Amino acid sequence: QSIDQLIKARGKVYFGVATDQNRLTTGKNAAIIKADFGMVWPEESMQWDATEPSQGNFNFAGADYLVNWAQQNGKLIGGGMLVWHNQLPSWVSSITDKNTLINVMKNHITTLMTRYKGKIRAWDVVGEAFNEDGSLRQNVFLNVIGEDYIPIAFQTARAADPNAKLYIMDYNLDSASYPKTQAIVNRVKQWRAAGVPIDGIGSQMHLSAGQGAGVLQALPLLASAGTPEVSILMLDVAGASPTDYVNVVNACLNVQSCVGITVFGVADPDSWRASSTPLLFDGNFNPKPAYNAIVQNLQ
Numbered sequence: 001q002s003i004d005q006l007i008k009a010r011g012k013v014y015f016g017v018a019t020d021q022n023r024l025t026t027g028k029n030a031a032i033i034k035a036d037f038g039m040v041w042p043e044e045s046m047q048w049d050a051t052e053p054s055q056g057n058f059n060f061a062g063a064d065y066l067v068n069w070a071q072q073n074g075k076l077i078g079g080g081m082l083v084w085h086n087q088l089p090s091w092v093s094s095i096t097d098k099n100t101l102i103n104v105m106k107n108h109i110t111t112l113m114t115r116y117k118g119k120i121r122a123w124d125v126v127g128e129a130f131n132e133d134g135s136l137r138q139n140v141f142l143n144v145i146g147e148d149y150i151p152i153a154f155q156t157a158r159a160a161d162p163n164a165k166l167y168i169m170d171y172n173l174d175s176a177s178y179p180k181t182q183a184i185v186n187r188v189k190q191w192r193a194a195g196v197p198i199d200g201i202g203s204q205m206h207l208s209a210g211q212g213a214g215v216l217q218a219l220p221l222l223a224s225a226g227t228p229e230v231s232i233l234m235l236d237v238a239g240a241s242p243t244d245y246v247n248v249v250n251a252c253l254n255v256q257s258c259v260g261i262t263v264f265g266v267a268d269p270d271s272w273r274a275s276s277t278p279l280l281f282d283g284n285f286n287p288k289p290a291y292n293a294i295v296q297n298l299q
């Protein structure tokens with residue numbers, strides 16, 4: 001049974017998965033995604049280094065493959081990450097003046113988003129912008145541009161494709177008592193009051209065993225920022241306990257603005273922490289207890 005179809009039957013938009021050309025051409029990834037997931041995200045093919053390895057010199061080989069594959073197979077598409085400190089070429093991080101970095105950032109956002117205008121459900125515009133204590137992370141954008149990089153990024157994104165849901169996302173937002181969770185909510189409320197078009201908060205959810213329960217109160221906290229949507233992204237869970245996965249699903253079901261859940265890959269061996277068996281399919285591409293528990297929970 002398809003957890004995407006089942007979550008849609010509960011009124012959500014999708015159950016999604018991160019993938020890319022290199023996954024889709026091998027193993028059983030394509031077959032599983034066709035059957036069981038309703039949205040795909042590019043693991044790497046829309047990151048900054050993949051799409052703009054030198055200034056103004058873009059490439060969309062991997063991104064085009066995924067977008068066209070999704071269209072061929074009736075899947076929704078998310079894109080990202082437009083602005084964050086990971087997967088950032090040295091030519092960007094070496095910029096030390098505000099206006100150059102603004103222009104480079106705007107050009108990057110606009111070029112990526114306009115290529116697939118109208119076809120992308122959501123873009124992760126800004127990622128991992130917060131420190132653990134809730135202050136803003138001093139990535140190159142914050143240090144060189146200042147706080148206005150986040151307003152600028154979202155306003156540029158809205159102009160490039162007004163149909164796309166624009167997301168800020170971060171990790172370690174899995175407890176309502178954690179300062180980072182409280183800080184992103186306070187800052188997003190104030191940014192939206194300032195007119196920044198932040199449509200969504202995405203929770204980049206890398207759980208250790210037992211942390212699913214905390215999401216029950218963390219996700220409603222994130223939703224109190226007043227964004228139209230929240231989502232769970234890059235989900236994986238050390239040990240893949242049915243309990244942890246079911247708690248995460250229940251949290252999204254309980255939050256009316258939660259549109260869906262994306263897991264960070266199909267099969268355990270391909271995970272960045274494969275040996276913690278943190279995904280929903282095992283090394284034989286067979287559904288794991290956690291998958292079956294999600295099915296039963298959604299039925």
Ligand SMILES: O=[N+]([O-])c1ccc2nn[nH]c2c1
Binds near residue numbers: 079232233234235
């Ligand atoms: O949710 N995701 O699995 C996911 C994967 C890659 C991304 N790059 N930007 N945002 C992303 C989300």
